Amino acid sequence: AEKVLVTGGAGYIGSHTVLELLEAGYLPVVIDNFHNAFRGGGSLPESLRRVQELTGRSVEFEEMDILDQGALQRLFKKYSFMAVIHFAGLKAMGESVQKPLDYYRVNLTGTIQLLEIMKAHGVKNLVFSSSATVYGNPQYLPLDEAHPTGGCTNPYGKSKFFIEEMIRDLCQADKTWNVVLLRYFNPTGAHASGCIGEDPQGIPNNLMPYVSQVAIGRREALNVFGNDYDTEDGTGVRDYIHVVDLAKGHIAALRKLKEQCGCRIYNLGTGTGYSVLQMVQAMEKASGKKIPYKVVARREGDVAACYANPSLAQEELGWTAALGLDRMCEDLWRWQKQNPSGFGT
Amino acid sequence: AEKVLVTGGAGYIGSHTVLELLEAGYLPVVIDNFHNAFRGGGSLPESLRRVQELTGRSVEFEEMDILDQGALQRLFKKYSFMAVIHFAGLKAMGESVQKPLDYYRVNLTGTIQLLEIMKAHGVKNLVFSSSATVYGNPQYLPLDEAHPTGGCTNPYGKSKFFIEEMIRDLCQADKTWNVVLLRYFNPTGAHASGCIGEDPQGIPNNLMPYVSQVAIGRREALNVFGNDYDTEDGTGVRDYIHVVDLAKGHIAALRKLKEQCGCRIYNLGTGTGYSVLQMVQAMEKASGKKIPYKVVARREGDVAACYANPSLAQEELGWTAALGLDRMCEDLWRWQKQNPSGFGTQA
Ligand SMILES: NC(=O)c1ccc[n+]([C@@H]2O[C@H](COP(=O)([O-])OP(=O)(O)OC[C@H]3O[C@@H](n4cnc5c(N)ncnc54)[C@H](O)[C@@H]3O)[C@@H](O)[C@H]2O)c1
Ligand SMILES: NC(=O)c1ccc[n+]([C@@H]2O[C@H](COP(=O)([O-])OP(=O)(O)OC[C@H]3O[C@@H](n4cnc5c(N)ncnc54)[C@H](O)[C@@H]3O)[C@@H](O)[C@H]2O)c1
Ligand SMILES: O=c1ccn([C@@H]2O[C@H](COP(=O)(O)OP(=O)(O)O[C@H]3O[C@H](CO)[C@H](O)[C@H](O)[C@H]3O)[C@@H](O)[C@H]2O)c(=O)[nH]1
Ligand SMILES: O=c1ccn([C@@H]2O[C@H](COP(=O)(O)OP(=O)(O)O[C@H]3O[C@H](CO)[C@H](O)[C@H](O)[C@H]3O)[C@@H](O)[C@H]2O)c(=O)[nH]1
Ligand SMILES: [Cl-]
Ligand SMILES: [Cl-]
Ligand SMILES: [Cl-]
Ligand SMILES: [Mg+2]
């Protein structure tokens, strides 16, 4: 009726989105099981506790797992939701290939359970966290929504594609459902306040947090996974997108659902690709620190270059990413410098 | 001393497979929730009660849903399974397109749960019921295992494809798993005793049972779904395979698992395609009755022709579909004639 349910809202993208929702006047209800979120000193996960402080608005939260039908039932009885933004899931941490069942359980079974409860309670409006990984090895660049999908390299990406397909099927079968599938490119950056940001545990698998950790002195040097691709400089190229813009894209998705759009799919990227070395350099500039690097072997399954065609999202969702490279680096640096250990110990 | 778990064992293919298993010396434990199986006068589904009589061997059975985590866990705890043959699932009554979530829950989440429970109990040998539908609209024929998969039309076929992908990944990640994915073509026929067979509830959605129902005099005429396809006679072409041969292919699969085979995928078909009209004619011959029919509109999603390339199975599985068209028709007829209304509890 009123509320927006946000699954996995304590995570990186989700917490930034909760913040945007609150500032836009929405009332979110967040759920998370702390699988990859840090527990604050109170009820709320630290990220959310900080979002509350930042917005001066309260965060309604419930600790729970999407795999728990009982809890889902109780949740859906307690609140009247008008839409669900689904961030909860396991992300490839490079782990996927080795633990397929965990991925398929959490991402597939958990999403199906969510979809079923939504259907049961008549909440047929969803915004889903998809990924450019669904396009597989790029056939052409930039990647537009019409590029082929499926034929993924890993259990994680396959999981994303399977979910998109299930949702398409659901929308076909029941014309009352509205779903916006958002294919994120490479999220980076952090809220301008520097109070929240990505909080990886252990050695980061993604570039940016590793880069930021070298700059802060936590890591000796960045290992660059190959310099022999068919890219202007030999290193992998990606469409780095500021998490704040990404979060704002979810609000635009909400408005889209109101149009009774059925199933729509949009890329959420800037359309500008940057190489590993370019990112390193920009981080040196932002941080004022040196970021030593070593060229190592190619990482299994890595693609040479991946970047988005942002046209459709601009035309249909009315959204474009506003923040550039320098801004992403400055914000990421601020978060890292201001929070040397992430959210806590 | 180790058993074989048979999920969905009370159904068409499963009952036939339980019979083959019993005859070949295996010890099955069968589970079914009666979603699409008839309850016997006793605890056993009628089909399995008959299999017990036919074989003179006991059938260990538990009424249970694969979606029931607690029950499934207790089952794996109670027995020491050496392998699992997974038949349980929803097939479609042309329904899948309209109830996607049901297919995704029962087929997809049900199998993920089964695989998790299996892993947890140290059982990593699986025989999975797949289908030629995973190939989608044929890009060429005959369909060999190398033909592209995915790109299916309905939720049912998508579920099967997603399951195959999941198992392939599992095997890739853990070399200790062994899994045989069998892509069945169009199973037909019945055990030669005539005591068991396909037992549809209501108007049959598949060809053969409808034809037999007409031949027995229950139905007026066969409705032929389109006659304008690009095939010899305009009617759809399919690779019909005798359920007994299909069932025996499961025994071959268990043998394959014992070879520490990893993930293997095999078509289970005869390699010979027959049209709708050719099947009617064969049924006329078996039944000794004229079988009328009327041509109606095309059935949404139907492919023109589909048939297998059965060489890989012959070679690697050491299995071949022995029974021909007449046998299939004669066996189907015997079952239908001796059991005009399908299964019923004992008198
Ligand atoms: N970060 C990326 O580069 C990226 C790229 C593409 C798509 N995505 C997708 O976007 C979504 C959010 O990504 P993120 O970077 O914010 O990751 P994240 O791990 O920070 O956020 C996911 C949140 O979900 C929660 N969660 C996990 N399993 C849960 C369960 N069973 N029940 C309830 N909560 C559960 C975690 O505790 C975490 O707080 C995910 O679906 C991710 O796969 C992210
Ligand atoms: N019949 C065909 O032409 C065909 C073709 C391709 C693949 N397959 C597959 O082979 C398998 C067997 O098909 P069949 O023709 O014997 O179908 P069937 O319906 O006779 O057999 C399936 C059995 O599974 C049981 N079942 C369903 N949901 C269950 C659940 N949640 N828990 C436990 N048991 C459950 C049903 O009661 C039934 O006895 C199915 O997975 C089917 O999709 C069949
Ligand atoms: O320590 C690192 C990390 C990354 N990179 C390079 O930086 C680029 C971006 O790498 P990320 O890992 O941040 O992101 P990806 O776009 O390559 O995404 C891939 O890696 C993600 C993080 O591992 C997820 O696993 C995701 O499923 C998978 O598609 C790539 O060219 C990568 O080779 C390095 O050189 N060194
Ligand atoms: O009453 C019937 C039934 C079938 N047929 C035709 O007979 C052939 C075999 O049809 P079946 O339904 O027995 O088997 P299929 O292999 O064609 O499978 C198709 O039907 C399945 C069950 O009927 C599912 O619907 C599946 O999605 C779909 O591909 C097809 O050419 C079909 O058009 C008829 O003319 N009339
Ligand atoms: Cl696993
Ligand atoms: Cl953009
Ligand atoms: Cl549904
Ligand atoms: Mg061959």
Side-chain angles (χ1 to χ4, degrees), chain A residues 1-178 180-345, chain B residues 1-178 180-347:
Chain A
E2 1 78 314
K3 322 253 166 129
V4 175
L5 169 68
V6 187
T7 79
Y12 177 38
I13 307 173
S15 65
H16 283 86
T17 303
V18 172
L19 184 149
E20 296 301 327
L21 287 160
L22 286 168
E23 293 290 349
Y26 293 87
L27 301 164
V29 176
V30 177
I31 66 169
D32 207 289
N33 72 353
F34 293 88
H35 174 260
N36 190 37
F38 190 75
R39 216 181 276 277
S43 243
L44 293 178
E46 186 62 12
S47 61
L48 297 173
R49 191 195 63 79
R50 293 192 194 191
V51 166
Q52 211 166 243
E53 188 285 327
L54 289 161
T55 56
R57 302 178 172 84
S58 145
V59 175
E60 206 151 16
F61 176 78
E62 215 87 81
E63 174 177 0
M64 65 168 282
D65 197 310
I66 63 177
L67 294 174
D68 185 342
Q69 20 219 7
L72 280 175
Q73 301 185 313
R74 299 199 296 275
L75 181 79
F76 274 80
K77 302 200 190 163
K78 185 171 177 172
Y79 297 98
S80 228
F81 293 125
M82 61 163 202
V84 172
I85 299 169
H86 183 39
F87 294 103
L90 290 194
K91 35 179 210 180
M93 256 184 213
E95 307 217 353
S96 85
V97 172
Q98 316 301 333
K99 47 123 101 155
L101 294 189
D102 300 328
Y103 276 86
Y104 288 131
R105 174 188 74 257
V106 179
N107 292 355
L108 309 186
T109 297
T111 298
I112 291 163
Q113 293 191 177
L114 178 63
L115 289 180
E116 292 193 275
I117 197 85
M118 286 173 70
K119 176 177 184 207
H121 291 257
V123 186
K124 299 158 169 193
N125 291 299
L126 175 67
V127 177
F128 174 64
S129 301
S130 191
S131 170
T133 181
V134 302
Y135 293 117
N137 190 16
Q139 290 173 34
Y140 58 90
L141 291 171
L143 296 166
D144 60 351
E145 296 81 353
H147 182 290
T149 59
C152 305
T153 312
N154 72 353
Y156 165 86
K158 245 134 70 141
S159 82
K160 289 298 193 179
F161 170 66
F162 293 169
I163 296 157
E164 287 196 348
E165 290 308 295
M166 294 186 289
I167 298 163
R168 280 183 206 271
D169 289 356
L170 174 60
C171 288
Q172 197 62 317
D174 175 359
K175 290 336 185 99
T176 296
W177 266 87
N178 299 303
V180 178
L181 320 187
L182 302 172
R183 286 169 183 161
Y184 309 154
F185 277 70
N186 289 64
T188 102
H191 187 268
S193 70
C195 297
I196 60 176
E198 191 174 1
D199 185 43
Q201 305 298 299
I203 304 169
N205 122 289
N206 299 296
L207 178 68
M208 310 304 294
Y210 197 104
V211 167
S212 77
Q213 294 183 11
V214 169
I216 200 181
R218 190 167 157 194
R219 315 279 167 205
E220 299 296 334
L222 171 68
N223 292 129
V224 180
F225 303 147
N227 65 353
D228 63 352
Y229 288 96
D230 155 36
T231 65
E232 94 101 324
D233 80 11
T235 70
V237 164
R238 304 286 184 271
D239 190 332
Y240 297 95
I241 180 180
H242 200 298
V243 70
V244 172
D245 278 320
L246 208 75
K248 290 178 183 290
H250 289 75
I251 313 289
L254 284 180
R255 291 187 291 272
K256 200 65 172 156
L257 291 177
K258 298 285 178 199
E259 298 181 9
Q260 255 99 274
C261 62
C263 185
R264 308 285 189 103
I265 304 188
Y266 306 103
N267 280 333
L268 290 193
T270 62
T272 297
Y274 288 108
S275 84
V276 177
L277 301 187
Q278 290 176 293
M279 295 311 279
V280 170
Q281 296 161 228
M283 282 297 296
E284 279 185 327
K285 293 193 317 187
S287 77
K289 301 277 179 287
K290 267 84 218 140
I291 301 174
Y293 67 91
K294 307 185 186 180
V295 182
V296 306
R298 291 183 169 198
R299 176 172 66 186
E300 198 178 77
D302 270 346
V303 130
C306 178
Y307 54 93
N309 178 156
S311 297
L312 183 67
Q314 173 172 7
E315 177 82 355
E316 290 194 6
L317 267 189
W319 167 96
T320 65
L323 313 177
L325 176 66
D326 298 331
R327 181 56 187 274
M328 288 176 244
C329 292
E330 157 184 53
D331 296 342
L332 175 62
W333 176 243
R334 185 192 297 99
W335 155 246
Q336 178 74 80
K337 168 209 186 244
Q338 302 181 184
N339 306 264
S341 347
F343 284 122
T345 321
Chain B
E2 295 190 0
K3 327 274 240 241
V4 171
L5 173 62
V6 183
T7 81
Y12 181 35
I13 308 166
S15 59
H16 283 85
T17 304
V18 174
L19 183 147
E20 295 300 334
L21 286 163
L22 289 167
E23 293 284 6
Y26 294 85
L27 298 164
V29 171
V30 185
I31 65 178
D32 207 290
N33 70 351
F34 292 107
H35 173 79
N36 190 41
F38 187 87
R39 292 161 189 277
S43 58
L44 289 175
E46 186 52 11
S47 64
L48 303 184
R49 190 199 60 73
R50 299 194 187 188
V51 164
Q52 218 163 232
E53 241 166 43
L54 289 170
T55 69
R57 298 164 141 118
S58 52
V59 168
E60 228 174 322
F61 174 83
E62 286 188 30
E63 170 178 0
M64 173 184 311
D65 191 316
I66 59 175
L67 296 170
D68 185 343
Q69 200 169 246
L72 243 207
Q73 290 171 164
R74 283 194 317 283
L75 188 74
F76 277 85
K77 183 170 173 195
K78 174 180 172 170
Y79 296 97
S80 293
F81 296 125
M82 61 170 241
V84 175
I85 301 178
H86 184 40
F87 294 103
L90 301 187
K91 25 167 228 179
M93 163 115 173
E95 317 195 17
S96 80
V97 167
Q98 323 287 331
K99 48 126 110 169
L101 303 175
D102 295 340
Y103 283 79
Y104 295 130
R105 173 185 75 251
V106 184
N107 297 357
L108 191 50
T109 81
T111 299
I112 287 173
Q113 169 159 276
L114 169 68
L115 288 174
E116 288 198 285
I117 292 168
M118 278 175 73
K119 186 175 155 66
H121 290 84
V123 184
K124 297 171 161 185
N125 290 302
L126 176 70
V127 181
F128 175 64
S129 297
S130 195
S131 157
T133 61
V134 303
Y135 292 119
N137 185 28
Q139 290 168 42
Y140 63 81
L141 295 165
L143 298 163
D144 54 346
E145 296 87 347
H147 184 288
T149 55
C152 293
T153 22
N154 56 246
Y156 166 74
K158 277 194 230 185
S159 75
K160 291 294 199 190
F161 169 67
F162 298 166
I163 295 160
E164 286 198 354
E165 295 305 298
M166 284 192 18
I167 299 166
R168 271 210 221 252
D169 299 348
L170 177 65
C171 289
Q172 182 45 218
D174 174 4
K175 305 324 214 253
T176 62
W177 270 88
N178 306 301
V180 173
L181 321 182
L182 306 166
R183 296 177 175 149
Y184 315 152
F185 280 65
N186 288 60
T188 105
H191 185 256
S193 69
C195 291
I196 59 169
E198 188 169 14
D199 189 47
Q201 178 200 65
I203 302 162
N205 308 270
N206 51 327
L207 185 63
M208 312 299 294
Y210 205 105
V211 171
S212 65
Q213 283 187 15
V214 166
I216 198 73
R218 190 166 159 192
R219 324 216 175 243
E220 193 184 21
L222 165 73
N223 280 182
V224 166
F225 305 150
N227 67 351
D228 59 0
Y229 287 98
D230 175 35
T231 59
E232 201 147 345
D233 69 24
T235 70
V237 172
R238 304 287 184 268
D239 186 327
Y240 293 102
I241 172 167
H242 201 299
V243 68
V244 166
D245 274 330
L246 198 103
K248 285 173 193 293
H250 292 75
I251 283 58
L254 287 177
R255 291 172 351 237
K256 195 64 158 172
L257 292 167
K258 264 87 98 162
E259 289 177 10
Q260 302 303 316
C261 65
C263 179
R264 302 285 167 161
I265 306 190
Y266 308 108
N267 282 331
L268 295 186
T270 68
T272 297
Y274 290 108
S275 77
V276 175
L277 310 182
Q278 293 181 284
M279 295 307 284
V280 169
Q281 170 180 251
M283 281 299 293
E284 287 183 323
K285 176 175 159 171
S287 65
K289 313 291 288 154
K290 291 296 222 100
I291 298 166
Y293 71 86
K294 176 235 234 187
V295 182
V296 287
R298 271 177 180 208
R299 182 169 59 186
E300 131 181 302
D302 275 3
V303 313
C306 172
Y307 55 93
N309 177 322
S311 38
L312 187 69
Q314 278 174 283
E315 289 137 23
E316 290 195 10
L317 223 45
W319 164 95
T320 189
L323 315 165
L325 174 64
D326 290 344
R327 257 304 292 278
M328 286 182 231
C329 291
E330 296 152 0
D331 292 347
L332 169 45
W333 182 237
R334 183 190 300 97
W335 149 252
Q336 174 80 79
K337 200 185 109 188
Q338 299 186 179
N339 306 269
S341 70
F343 285 124
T345 61
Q346 276 180 307

